[PDB]
Amino acid sequence: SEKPYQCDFKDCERRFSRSDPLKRHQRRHTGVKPFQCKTCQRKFSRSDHLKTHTRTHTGEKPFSCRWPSCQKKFARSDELVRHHNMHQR
DNA sequence: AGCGTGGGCGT
DNA sequence: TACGCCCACGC
Ligand SMILES: [Zn+2]
Ligand SMILES: [Zn+2]
Ligand SMILES: [Zn+2]
User: Fold this and answer.
1) Is the separation of the CB atoms in A7 and A13 below 8 Å?
2) Domain A1-89 belongs to what topology?
3) Cβ of A40 less than 7 A from strand C
4) Most CB atoms within 10 A, among A3, A5, A39, A60?
């Protein structure tokens, strides 16, 4: 089996290569949200998704456009990616 | 646009 | 086990 770790929840055939993505996954079923924003008290299933959320409060935008003459900055990498693909297109 | 929230992955 | 990235979908 290329993905030995199967989810044993009702009507879920999801499988993974490693054990930790299975645990992360299973927080969908249980609604468990370990991490919490200290600003708006909102809780999140994943710590990385919390840190990006925090930037909605702080206004931090670590991702700059590499295109010349462009000063656009973004909070997440995927936003910069969508922006970069907007230039080349 | 701005961002919630998934999987895949390196370390 | 953990953190922190990329990438992606879908409003
Ligand atoms: Zn499952
Ligand atoms: Zn918040
Ligand atoms: Zn740009």
Assistant:
1) yes
2) Double Stranded RNA Binding Domain (3.30.160)
3) no
4) A5
